[PDB]
Design a protein around this ligand. Sequence first.
Ligand SMILES: CC(=O)N[C@H]1[NH2+]C[C@H](C(=O)O)[C@H](O)[C@@H]1O
Length: 485
Amino acid sequence: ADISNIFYAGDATKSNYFRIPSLLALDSGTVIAAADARYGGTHDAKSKINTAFAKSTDGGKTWGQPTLPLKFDDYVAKNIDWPRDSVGKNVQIQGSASYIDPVLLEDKETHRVFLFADMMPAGIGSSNASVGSGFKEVDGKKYLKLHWKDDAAGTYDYSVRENGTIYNDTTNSATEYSVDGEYNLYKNGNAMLCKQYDYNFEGTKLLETQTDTDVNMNVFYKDADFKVFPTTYLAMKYSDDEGETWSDLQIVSTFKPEESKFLVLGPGVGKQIANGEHAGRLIVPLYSKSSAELGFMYSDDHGNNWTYVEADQNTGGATAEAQIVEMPDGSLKTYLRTGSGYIAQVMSTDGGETWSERVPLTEIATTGYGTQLSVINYSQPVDGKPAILLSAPNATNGRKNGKIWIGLISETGNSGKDKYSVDWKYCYSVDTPQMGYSYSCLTELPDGEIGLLYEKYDSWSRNELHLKNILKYERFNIDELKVQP
Ligand SMILES: CC(=O)N[C@H]1[NH2+]C[C@H](C(=O)O)[C@H](O)[C@@H]1O
């Protein structure tokens, strides 16, 4: 029979809505997953969103209680039905910080799991982020900048330095203030507190009000004593015990270009290179409104340092979400969304440092604004060939008609970026052409089965906002997918 949720309204997240699936089988056989826990309807930031996470230790069949490894506490986490009328549907939480659009990655060499998300200061999301990195240089060293509450609004005369100590940069001296690994604020070693906000509707009016509950004050919150520059940040935590415990929060977007408005994640999974001289490199897809649209961050030292790469010179700031697969020789093929009405592919022969021009992919119909996709390597040959799988909608209007494709890789006899071709030989229909189908993430489960976590609705449509239980999990055998329609 069926019968298919990981995250759902009423689970331990206390969220009624979810979006932006991520699904990843670990080298051990454990399977994990993540998604946005979108409390305030299915809206993008600005809102209140935490990153949810869950684990399966029976091969991706039974899923435990979800956890929230990236969370903010300025607004309460609760189950609330967001109005779906013509006016209220548009209403968003105004004053909350958020984590949005997750990426999971495993370093198989060290058995470390990384979870990434975009990290949005209170009231911010991509569309209203300010231009700039949010970091300053003090004596040539990058530090997160901070604005003190009694300084002028545009003045950021403070910085977070070693051990979370907050410095006054006009005198170069340590203050009595610091932040811990959540970026919560301390004064002379004592937790700073503020009241939590609640949210409730009265008709179509959204009331954001302080409660009596004290939470930690945090530099990402709307009226904290010190506050960050209001732009998009990239956050990461790692786990050496498959998500039992997590590290302190790393803000890894030190490299955010000063000309950029936002620089954010391509949701899904990252990749570790298996073959060739960059074997072991970890790479994570990004996009921006900047000098470049498509970009990546990579680490040659198992996660300690990250280098930013621009993949193009597009200043359009389209939603160029990408996912990455590896060819047998270790070169990379990236498949990305664009704002141009096709999925595009770009190639790299130097482990992701440089990339070819976009090739429009014509097997798949998509919309003008586009939809995220998922692409993965498969570990067993298919029809005697190395294979990749792609999941995406397939429709010119609307997010619908989801397919899983299988691509078979051949050496063309040519050189470099032209060395392989892919034959999209198979195409499996997940439901039917009229049924909603948006974001998705594939994984290869330990039994060679394919797992899929996906949005079973049109998450772009202003008429399908704020639907519950649309995030759906299914498993397939490879034979089932080998369809030729
Ligand atoms: C960070 C952010 O706002 N990301 C959003 N970008 C638009 C996407 C889409 O469905 O096209 C998602 O809404 C995504 O969360």
